[PDB]
Design a protein around this ligand. Structure first.
Ligand SMILES: C#C[C@]1(COP(=O)(O)OP(=O)(O)OP(=O)(O)O)O[C@@H](n2ccc3c(N)nc(Cl)nc32)C[C@@H]1O
Ligand SMILES: [Mg+2]
Ligand SMILES: [Mg+2]
Lengths: 549, 395
DNA sequence: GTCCCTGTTCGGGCGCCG
DNA sequence: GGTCGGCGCCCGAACAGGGACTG
């Protein structure tokens, strides 16, 4: 049938006109199925034959389906899409099985040739012209930008009466895929299911029994849903022996997708292998740490794993745990050792950072993702000492926060690796540091003077004012003892080092962190530059020599 | 009722802002409110052929099972004063958004008010609506409801000429020098007035000056911190001088060594203590420029602010002190802060300020709606500050 | 202003669903 | 092979913002 639902009005962009692309070289088997489709659709009113009053054309093709027996008739509207009006996408994200409540009776089903059951707008149907080796669409074509959004809007309009009159049957609606849950006995359930198939039919929408799943395990959205557990459909990893950029991409994609129920997956090293490339085809050597990361991920994926479903009665819990190099894995459950789902956070936000900032970022990620899936926020189990957190959000100048949580002794634990004094150290040598660098030559100097007579000035090449300032701080850390007071006039460096980082994209700052961890009391103070305040003044005359004025 | 044609500014298309994840209770309240607003013809479902979108959520007010829907209309508001009010003893803020719902909206413009309700775990594509009346939260809503509201409030004003009734967005500020009680009773008279057609204290708002430490001993370090703070403040107060204090440091002293304050130093410091008392000179409010607000976290539930427009030309500098408990929610404190500050900036100038928040943007957006309580939403942007300014406004 | 460094967004490739 | 939309991740390119600098 063709839905008697009103067609969504669709125009083109101002001053644009339809496609005039001509067919490409086409294998026959594809053309045989093309015509066998095209002619049955023409029978059904889904495509109408056009003549030469229509100057438009666009390439078509086909592909196998999940069945693999039937054929998907795709059109290649790159040009038409470029010229069609803009829409507001209504698919706002993907449903996740871990946000399914336990239902007494369930069905999954799929709609018969769905796009081709929903009427295109007449005034638009002309730009949908194609020639099979001449028709036009009176329904929704596959490959057109507006067909997703339009289908989904429409399907919602259709289902709206049913949901209104059946508010206690839950209908998860992705594209035409419908999962239907109820708390009824199986009998009355199938009654309500036939009632919904009747409704969909009334709007011209067939639910082929071929795709009408009645018994568990319901195959849905890439998972298998059993009545009290769910699991992801099996994952197979690429097992090459020479990997390329695209072999790598697909590997990381399979991994990320796995990470949602396989706890512990790690992709940072592999991902880092992707830095700097150009084309999909560049074969690249696995580094030993990427190699080993792959090894341990593979080891993970051999084991069995399943989520459960969401009980709103119980609390939501997220527990987080640390791997190296700013990698983090979390598990969200409601009842110990019964994962609702797992995950991983690795994003590196910042030139400089520390484990505490990363943990908070992880918490935010999980909070937003929990809101999406269950509409509420989890309670946390975090490997950070209530003290480490009190100290941190005490001293740190940015607003920062973590919802209800509790500690869990699960090494590695999170700690700040050092601390800056609040007041200057009695008996600690005082270093006035400074650097300066020339903008034309890229020559600079960095050094210090000390209240105890010492003074050092190091020359640098291909450097930057900020770099010199950090170089002088590093120098002073290198040559001082276990307690030192430092005075710099570079709020950039002060701003980095107060933040208490423990990893940096910069090597200079990593060496600096190593020094700061080694000491026992550091005090870092600021003074405005070029204002004659000793001994900022003396060191500034020292490094400004030969590279300034 | 006849409809006022409204258009966008030239060379601007409407808003295209994605809807951000709501919580189950926020969604359910939004859907309740929205089905009744459809039953009353204020909103109409729309499709994906309308490419405009503005976010929507909802707030819970204190101790009342009533929810309020908030549309985040600032992107659209972009695309479209009683100076004695700061001087009243008591000032009550009334919500009067419902009134806008009684006037139709220009049809040509309804497609720009478009919004999408989300659904939990994406059970369902976004459910889209557009506005048929005047929307709560839009710049043009009070613009159009102008004459209607001057009519409505004619008799109440003529009756109580010592009262001030300001309107901004969906809010009505009523200020009077009445006693608490007589004030509240007059407010109830005004509510009964409004229902025929169908608590702030500006006196107690204080500026927080920059202040210098008073000590008996002074160390090399304390003096460098003083000279740094004065050097900065001189950019606001040109009368600040730092000659003498500076010269005391001259040479490569250990931070902990104590220096004694020479007579000129002690006088320069006392004169600089004065100069920081005089108010700022040459700072006049420009209505054609945005107000900017910077907020610094000083710790201990202490939050300092400055409202300005040209750098160093602070229109006002304030502070906001909350519970210093061990259960302090920094985000909660910050939003409560920015709401108070927006109220001050509205009462003083009738404009909202753009904020420079000290917070990771994600951290902000995750929670900040959990604690909102006002019918408007001011612009904001996120900063990565050095604790230099932080150290300067300290106490 | 220019240069330097930090941050954000936006679009590219893969993955996953229909 | 070759189309579309959504979401995720990750990277790089192109921005905006602010501090230090030259004569
Ligand atoms: C609604 C819907 C459907 C459902 O899929 P299906 O795989 O069930 O196909 P169908 O049309 O329902 O036919 P049937 O189920 O009888 O085999 O998703 C859409 N779809 C799918 C793959 C695909 C692509 N590769 N490019 C484009 Cl642009 N659209 C695509 C259109 C189809 O209508
Ligand atoms: Mg189908
Ligand atoms: Mg310098």
């Amino acid at each position: 049938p063709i839905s008697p639902i009103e067609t969504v009005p669709v125009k083109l962009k101002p001053g644009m006109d339809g496609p005039k692309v001509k067919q490409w070289p086409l294998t026959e088997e594809k053309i045989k199925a093309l015509v066998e489709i095209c002619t049955e659709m023409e029978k059904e009113g889904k495509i109408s034959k056009i003549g030469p009053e229509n100057p438009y054309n666009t390439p078509v093709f086909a592909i196998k389906k999940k069945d693999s027996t039937k054929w998907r008739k795709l059109v290649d509207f790159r040009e038409l899409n470029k010229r069609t009006q803009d829409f507001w996408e209504v698919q706002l994200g993907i449903p996740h099985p871990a946000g399914l409540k336990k239902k007494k009776s369930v069905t999954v089903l799929d709609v018969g040739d769905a796009y081709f059951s929903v009427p295109l707008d007449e005034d638009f149907r002309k730009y949908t012209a194609f020639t099979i080796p001449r028709y036009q669409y009176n329904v929704l074509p596959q490959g057109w930008k507006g067909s997703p959004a339009i289908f989904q809007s429409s399907m919602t309009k259709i289902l709206e009466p049913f949901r209104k009159q059946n508010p206690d049957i839950v209908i998860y609606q992705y594209m035409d895929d419908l999962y239907v849950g109820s708390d009824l006995e199986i009998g009355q359930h199938r009654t309500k299911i036939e009632e919904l198939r009747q409704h969909l039919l009334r709007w011209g929408l067939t639910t082929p029994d071929k795709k009408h799943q009645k018994e568990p395990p319901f195959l849905w959205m890439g998972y298998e849903l059993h009545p009290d557990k769910w699991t992801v459909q099996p994952i197979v990893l690429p097992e090459k022996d020479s990997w390329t950029v695209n072999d790598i991409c697909k590997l990381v994609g399979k991994l990320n997708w796995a990470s949602q129920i396989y706890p512990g997956i790690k992709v940072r090293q592999l991902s880092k292998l992707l830095r700097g490339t150009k084309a999909l085809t560049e074969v690249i050597p696995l580094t030993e740490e990427a190699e080993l990361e792959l090894a341990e991920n593979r080891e993970i994926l051999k084991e069995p794993v399943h989520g459960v479903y969401y009980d709103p009665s119980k609390d939501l819990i997220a527990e987080i745990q640390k791997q190296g190099q700013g990698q983090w894995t979390y598990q969200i459950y409601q009842e110990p050792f019964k994962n609702l789902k797992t995950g991983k956070y690795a994003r590196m936000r910042g030139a400089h950072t520390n484990d505490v900032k990363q943990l908070t970022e992880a918490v935010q990620k999980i909070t937003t993702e929990s809101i999406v899936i269950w509409g509420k926020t989890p309670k946390f189990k975090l490997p950070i000492q209530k003290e480490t957190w009190e100290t941190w959000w005490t001293e740190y100048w940015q607003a920062t926060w973590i919802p209800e949580w509790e500690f869990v002794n699960t090494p590695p634990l999170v700690k700040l690796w050092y601390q800056l004094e609040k007041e200057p150290i009695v008996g600690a040598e005082t270093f006035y540091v400074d650097g300066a660098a020339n903008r034309e030559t890229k020559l600079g100097k960095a050094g210090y003077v000390t209240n105890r007579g010492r003074q050092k000035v190091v020359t640098l090449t291909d450097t930057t004012n900020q770099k010199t300032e950090l170089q002088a701080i590093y120098l002073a850390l290198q040559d001082s003892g276990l307690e030192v007071n430092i005075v710099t006039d570079s709020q950039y460096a002060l701003g980095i080092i107060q933040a208490q980082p423990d990893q940096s994209e910069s090597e200079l700052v990593n060496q600096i962190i190593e020094q700061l961890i080694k000491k026992e009391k550091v005090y870092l103070a600021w003074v405005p530059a070029h204002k004659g305040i000793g001994g900022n003044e003396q060191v500034d005359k020292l490094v400004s020599a030969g590279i300034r004025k | 009722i006849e409809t006022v044609p409204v258009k966008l500014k030239p060379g601007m298309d409407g808003p295209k802002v994605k809807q951000w994840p709501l919580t189950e209770e926020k969604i359910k309240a939004l859907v309740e409110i929205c089905t009744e607003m459809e039953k009353e013809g204020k909103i109409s479902k729309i499709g994906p052929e309308n490419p405009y979108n503005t976010p929507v959520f909802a707030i819970k007010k204190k101790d009342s099972t009533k929810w309020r829907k908030l549309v985040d209309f600032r992107e659209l508001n972009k695309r479209t004063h009683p100076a004695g009010l700061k001087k009243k003893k008591s000032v009550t803020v009334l919500d009067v958004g419902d009134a806008y719902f009684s006037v139709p909206l220009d049809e040509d413009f309804r497609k720009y008010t478009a919004f999408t309700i989300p659904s939990i775990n994406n059970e369902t594509p976004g459910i889209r609506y557009q506005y048929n009346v005047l929307p709560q939260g839009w710049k043009g809503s009070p613009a159009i409801f102008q004459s209607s509201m001057t009519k409505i409030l004619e008799p109440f004003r003529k009756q109580n000429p010592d009262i001030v009734i300001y309107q901004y967005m969906d809010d009505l500020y009523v200020g009077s020098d009445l006693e608490i009680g007589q004030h509240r009773t007059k407010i109830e008279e005004l509510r009964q007035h409004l229902l025929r057609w169908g608590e702030l204290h500006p006196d107690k708002w204080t500026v927080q000056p920059i202040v210098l430490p008073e000590k008996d001993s002074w160390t090399v370090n304390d003096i460098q911190k003083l000279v740094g703070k004065l050097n900065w403040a001189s950019q606001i107060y040109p009368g600040i001088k730092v000659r003498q204090l500076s010269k005391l440091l001259r040479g490569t002293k250990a931070l902990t060594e104590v220096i004694p304050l020479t007579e000129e130093a002690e006088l320069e410091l006392a004169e600089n203590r004065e100069i920081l008392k005089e108010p700022v000179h040459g700072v006049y409010y420009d209505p054609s420029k945005d107000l900017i607000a910077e907020i610094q976290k000083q710790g201990q539930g202490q939050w300092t602010y400055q409202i300005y427009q040209e750098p160093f030309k602070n229109l006002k500098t304030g502070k906001y002190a909350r519970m210093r408990g061990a259960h302090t929610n920094d985000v909660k404190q910050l939003t409560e802060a920015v709401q108070k500050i927006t109220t001050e900036s509205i009462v003083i100038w009738g404009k909202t300020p753009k904020f420079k928040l000290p917070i990771q943007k994600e951290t902000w957006e995750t929670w900040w709606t959990e604690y909102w309580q006002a019918t408007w939403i001011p612009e904001w942007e996120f900063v990565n500050t050095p604790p230099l300014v932080k150290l300067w406004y300290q106490l």
